[PDB]
Amino acid sequence: SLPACPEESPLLVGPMLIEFNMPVDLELVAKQNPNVKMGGRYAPRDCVSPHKVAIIIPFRNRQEHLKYWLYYLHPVLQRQQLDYGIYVINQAGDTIFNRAKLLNVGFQEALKDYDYTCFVFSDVDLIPMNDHNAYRCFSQPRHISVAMDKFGFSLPYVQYFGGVSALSKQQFLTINGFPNNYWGWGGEDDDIFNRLVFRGMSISRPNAVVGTTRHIRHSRDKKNEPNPQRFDRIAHTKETMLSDGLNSLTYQVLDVQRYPLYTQITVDIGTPS
Numbered sequence: 671s672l673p674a675c676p677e678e679s680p681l682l683v684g685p686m687l688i689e690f691n692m693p694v695d696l697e698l699v700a701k702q703n704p705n706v707k708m709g710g711r712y713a714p715r716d717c718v719s720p721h722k723v724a725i726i727i728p729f730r731n732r733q734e735h736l737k738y739w740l741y742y743l744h745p746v747l748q749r750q751q752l753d754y755g756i757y758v759i760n761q762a763g764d765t766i767f768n769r770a771k772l773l774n775v776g777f778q779e780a781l782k783d784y785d786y787t788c789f790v791f792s793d794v795d796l797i798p799m800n801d802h803n804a805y806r807c808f809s810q811p812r813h814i815s816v817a818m819d820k821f822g823f824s825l826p827y828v829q830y831f832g833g834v835s836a837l838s839k840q841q842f843l844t845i846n847g848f849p850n851n852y853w854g855w856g857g858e859d860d861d862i863f864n865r866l867v868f869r870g871m872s873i874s875r876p877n878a879v880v881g882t883t884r885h886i887r888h889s890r891d892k893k894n895e896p897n898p899q900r901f902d903r904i905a906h907t908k909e910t911m912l913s914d915g916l917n918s919l920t921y922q923v924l925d926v927q928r929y930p931l932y933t934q935i936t937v938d939i940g941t942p943s
């Protein structure tokens with residue numbers, strides 16, 4: 671007997687001030703966010719959200735960015751009236767990073783907790799500047815971080831699909847999820863764009879003003895060097911997507927930690943095969 675949440679949330683305040691130069695205390699963030707439940711889960715008390723959103727962050731050795739991520743997103747996500755949870759998908763070991771494989775793990779592991787039907791994929795260091803930028807799913811795949819400060823507040827190219835995006839369960843399944851063999855930096859987001867287009871879809875986006883996004887400036891991570899096979903890889907997505915992705919995924923979860931503001935899944939995703 672709770673009614674549906676309004677279609678657009680009435681709590682939104684639009685543009686917001688964002689800064690990355692003060693310390694963050696997650697204990698304090700937890701106290702400021704008393705309705706977020708153990709594991710970083712929240713649904714609204716007064717109405718039923720149609721948006722069952724798992725937010726999936728690929729992660730290694732970025733604890734500082736993450737505290738800022740949690741400090742800023744958590745209040746935005748409750749204002750958006752989402753039935754959501756946060757998953758940080760922490761790559762075990764010290765071998766070459768694999769952004770997309772981690773995202774696949776996140777989708778698959780999150781589905782074990784709850785009937786999520788929408789998946790937000792968000793890099794850890796991207797903070798939206800306007801709460802009108804909806805962190806949930808549309809009838810087409812949604813690109814969220816459309817106007818990033820580091821790209822001069824516009825898209826670096828019109829097919830860019832990096833940074834932050836959202837796919838319904840069905841859209842994700844329809845493309846066999848993401849590729850597993852993009853190791854080191856670059857290209858996997860293009861592959862994922864290619865995948866959507868070969869399955870008859872197109873990219874939905876908010877306007878550049880609402881989609882304004884801040885990137886936390888940081889220097890290079892070691893163990894995520896530009897993948898030099900990225901350019902061949904994206905040229906063949908149509909064939910490779912058939913048998914690379916969800917339907918060829920394995921991993922070994924080493925540990926699951928329910929922190930107050932997020933679930934962290936530590937996972938062994940291997941090295942190139």
Ligand SMILES: CC(=O)N[C@H]1[C@H](OC[C@H]2O[C@@H](O)[C@H](O)[C@@H](O)[C@H]2O)O[C@H](CO)[C@@H](O)[C@@H]1O
Pocket residue numbers: 826827832855856857858859860900901904
């Ligand atoms: C394949 C790849 O590296 N994609 C990057 C992307 O690289 C910038 C890029 O612009 C494309 O349109 C050209 O096709 C390519 O050769 C490069 O000049 O940059 C974005 C954002 O940094 C990454 O998300 C992609 O992975």
Ligand SMILES: O=c1ccn([C@@H]2O[C@H](COP(=O)(O)OP(=O)(O)O)[C@@H](O)[C@H]2O)c(=O)[nH]1
Pocket residue numbers: 727728729730731732767769792793794795855891892893894
């Ligand atoms: O060592 C790493 C490499 C990357 N990432 C995650 O993968 C994303 C993509 O990499 P990156 O920050 O390098 O993008 P860039 O801003 O350099 O273009 C990051 O935002 C993090 O979520 C991480 O947590 N640890």
Ligand SMILES: [Mn+2]
Pocket residue numbers: 795885888
């Ligand atoms: Mn970054």
